[PDB]
Symmetry: D3
Subunit: 259 residues, 6 copies
């Protein structure tokens, strides 16, 4: 069976795909984090994994097992790391994980990697992981390893799509934690993991121009979300999914032109 997930292939099949030249590998990077009263906690892993799978199917790429645990939830982006259920890694651990995988891919013969982040707070640690691995590769004489890092939601740029998605004006990706964007993509991909009836509607989260630590629970909406997902629909999820899959597929074609 032609699976796009490396974990479902034999070693011989993987070896062949890599030896065939220009093989693109994709690593979903997510989190185990609270996502309100209406959705499950593995969202940030599921979403980018699903987007990877589809992109991989379109462009003939392979998908690695996704990073289930990400960096600590930040109040203004994920509610905060004081919530139960959210299980976060330290900076160094995330960074090291990414670094170790890149080194191993290099060992395999891979030279093309797409890292798809699904958890906002991961960014910089993913970036450090990449720099540190590339730095090591140079020590090993390898200079042709290329990585494309992206957060799938950033591919939703078209104002027409945004407008169609947010007929009320777009608030921003910051407060899109457990909101319309994710819940909707979730409704179209894993309906069993989402129950709109538990959505505790509330006004979009607002914060001062600074942060406070220890994180003050009172400053996050009780439900854990940063914006309400009552207007979330599967239809929206379907639109997002296509927009993302297509845009990412094209980006990858641009950065990783077949040889």
């Amino acid at each position: 069976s032609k699976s796009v997930f490396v974990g479902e292939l034999t070693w011989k099949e993987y070896e062949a795909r890599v030896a065939a030249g220009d093989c693109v590998l994709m690593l979903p990077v997510g989190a185990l984090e609270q996502h309100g009263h209406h959705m499950c906690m593995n969202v940030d892993v599921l979403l980018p994994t699903a987007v990877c799978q589809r992109v991989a199917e379109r462009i003939g790429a392979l998908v690695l097992p996704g990073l289930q645990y990400g960096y600590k939830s930040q109040q203004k982006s994920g509610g905060g790391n004081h919530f139960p259920g959210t299980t976060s890694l330290d900076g160094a651990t995330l960074t090291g994980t990414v670094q170790d995988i890149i080194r191993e891919l290099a060992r395999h013969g891979v030279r093309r990697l797409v890292l798809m982040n699904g958890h906002y707070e991961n960014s910089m640690f993913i970036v450090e992981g990449i720099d540190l691995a590339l730095r090591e590769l140079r020590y090993a004489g390898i200079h042709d390893f290329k990585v494309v890092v992206l957060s799938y939601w950033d591919f939703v740029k078209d104002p027409a799509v945004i407008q169609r998605l947010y007929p009320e004006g777009f608030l921003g990706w910051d407060i899109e934690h457990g909101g319309v964007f994710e819940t909707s993509l979730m409704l179209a991909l894993y309906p069993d993991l989402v129950d709109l009836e538990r959505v505790v509607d509330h006004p979009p989260a607002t914060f001062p121009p600074y942060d406070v630590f220890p994180v003050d629970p009172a400053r996050t909406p009780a439900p854990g979300t940063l914006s309400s997902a009552k207007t979330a629909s599967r239809e929206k999820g379907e639109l997002i999914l296509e927009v993302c899959v297509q845009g990412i597929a094209d980006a990858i074609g641009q950065e990783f032109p077949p040889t």
Copy 2:
């Protein structure tokens, strides 16, 4: 839907479970590693995750997202880290991962964790992770966190079952990499991920009383397996499954008596 996987629950459902007292958490610890010409490479994650799921169903416990990447494959227990596809973590990374997760579970209020290893080489790193996290927990005033660590195959002890499993004498867990045990359990759980027709039968791997680094590819059977899986049957897998689930379930009942 009563899922046993924490990742499929809302934070509120999880919070209630923990607050109810004596909630038991289960963390599958695996690897992405070549498993011969006849099986996929996520075996070491899939097996302990499946066993955890059934045990959790039987005893009312919860399962965490499994660690997909494990410690470097060793020649005498997994064929060696020179094989393509197998993607391994450095020891510090894996240790840090376990340590971060335990720390977070303590923050959640959990005090009962069962770590179920599916990759031989992870053991000592898992142990260090536990030790560092418990050390820290003491600094924090927490002395009631309890961990049970196990490699699921160790519960297949009954000589009658071993005999029935290996009518030819038991060779040992060492060379059980991609052999009868796993392929069998794989046949009863994920048949699509296993194709007995590609099994490259060969004599059980044998090694001198020492190890050589850099790992010498000639000292591992070409297929990557350390023993043949042609005698692997789904029936065998079914017997292993029950023995393991029942034995583990009981063990957890012993160590984690309901309060």
Copy 3:
């Protein structure tokens, strides 16, 4: 002389200010990074140090010696770390530094800290430094240390002020590297360090919804800036300064009410 810089005070003076209760400490966190053809490279340290000094003077707070080196410059926010002159730290070093400072301040008896970031890329590492330090403090029995983190430019929110600052529409803080904002504030504080005649005007930087590593120099404007600073004026700098100093001062009063 009543200096607001801890470094210019004697230990007895400092000790007194701390024993006096509710003493607020301020740490500037910047970088040594190229800022185009028209400004010096220590902007990210000077600016937040200047804002801290003035805020401190208004609220009676103390300012620490600023962190001169920051995290690696990123293409989409600082041009990239491939530029000469910019001298960056690894993520663990920056995090370590913040953590070490916080731990020592705690030792001093300080319980109130404001971290003022001047370099966009530092954020997450500062955050990690804070979390790791506070985690340690809890081990030490200290639970009343409070930290306020902020990037001074985030206090320029008022649309009227933004409009006055950017009569042409606001492009965003992303591309504000060596642009109007910084160069203006720079013209009102350190005019010697800025020479508008070298400003290589160019269209605002634009990037695809993803990142590439190794960093592609061609994707950054030649000058190193992400937006032109020709419309930068000292008058604008003066407005920004007051807006920031006032906003931050009031924020600190809210978060750190005198006891």
Copy 4:
């Protein structure tokens, strides 16, 4: 005086041996661990050091100063790290020590190392240290450094010798902590350090198919041993000693053929 211990040589003598070509270095790796009421705690260092010395005398190799401290004692292999006297290092420490040593040997010009473990628990950390050092060596252009790692007791494989050693059936290396094997070898090398009269006989240690942490002292024989050493005799020691020295010497001749 032709000592086989590097530490007893001048740097000029060592340099010549290394310069002479194919010089084999041997590093003993042990531990400071409780070994019952009847033996001293440095056993795990002394034993491998003694075997190294005699092997080196036979093949003309050199022996490094042994690593005195090893990884934390584990319940099912060495009684547990709760016992007084046993002084254990963290995993990163032991790994780093092995990594630093190999890096230095490489610097000297050495390209042949035999690591002789005497403490069961050290294995994986020694392995990580070897891996990390070799990786680094590649960065440095050195690909001809070869390492042989072994636990001296694994050289006792001959069923005839095992039978002669354990006329009662062999229990396994697991419970051979402070048992017949070590006590005997200790009676033939350092009798003053062993007093068979304090041997607290008890039935061989048995454990469930899993581990528990924090370590439960009640699960370990009060004496600290995992099997009785009353049947331990000097004669057995002498047989073990020869079997090991000879088998190891031959292995080294196989892996490190004179050039």
Copy 5:
């Protein structure tokens, strides 16, 4: 304006200086430490920074932003890290900082670095940072990076100058913390930051041939100094300044001959 400080140059100016060949960079390494009742706490940064500036002006070198935070104050050389105000870094942090800077300078194309230490305790950590950096550089194929490390006060060797400076016999650099040497140099450069009238005269600090931890506060003079600076004069400072500036200037000339 021809500034000698890299932070005050544009990147283009710096790039030109480096591309011109044999450009020498100077990094002041200090601390934020208590310096008695009479001086500010940034002395250790100020002093080496001042020396660097003057040397640089004489030999045409560039000066980096100084390390504001140094290693932990030790009792017998700096009073002890139990004093308020003194804010110290962990060894790993300081070493990492120096390692990172060196790595970056190498990236710039710099191959000549002068490290000027102003805090006694930094030495070995600066040394380890240099060693770790150079080791890495070799991995990267760079073998022509050369570092000169020095404590500016060591250039005050001439017995005549020593005599003239300490007409009473020289006590040693050990107790020269907040004493005559620094206070004088301080009087000739930053008079505002020094007030001789608060100088709490006391006999030179004496200690047994060992150290005690935790640091015992009673064993350190209450003022925080290890020797009195009442005899400190601006005149002395001027002498010291010239002696250091000239001696270091010449040393750099020797070590870094113009190409």
Copy 6:
């Protein structure tokens, strides 16, 4: 047999000694370092181990197995780490080894430790290890752990003894590497390991007031020593031994008064 070495005791004996109250532990910390043409390379371990043994015998203390590998040899104190045979650890490795051993001793119930350094360069890394351990201990609620650190040669202060030792004026401990002091003490303790006939006499090593890296081999005397040991005599060794053993013993009695 009343051995003063922990390693030669059973755990029960050790348990008793610790339980009896105020039991002092001593850790020799040395190196494997070239010591010229006339002596062996384990000197820095042997010497402090010997002195510990005798001090322990005199005050009833226990001695831990010594740290066989120390920090990188520095040109101005040990000749440099470019010499073959010398096998050094990274700073972090040394520091962690010290930190782990202290943590374990505290677990044992020990609260009194004497660290005796025999390798000049080890100092600051031993210090960091003590500080880190102590910091941890406080976290664990332990505040009565006390440590005394010393380099045994520092107890040779009496000008009469120095005169008697160096009838030619004392040069300093810096260039006392492989010189009279060590060679002498070596002649009275391990004559077999020293051969005065190979002593390559040379003038005391002299160096500019700065250091250069990479280490320049030409700046260190060819033999590896920093001062000639031709005037080294066993008689001198005996005098040193007593002066050290007595002065240390007294120091321990002062810092660790029997309860």
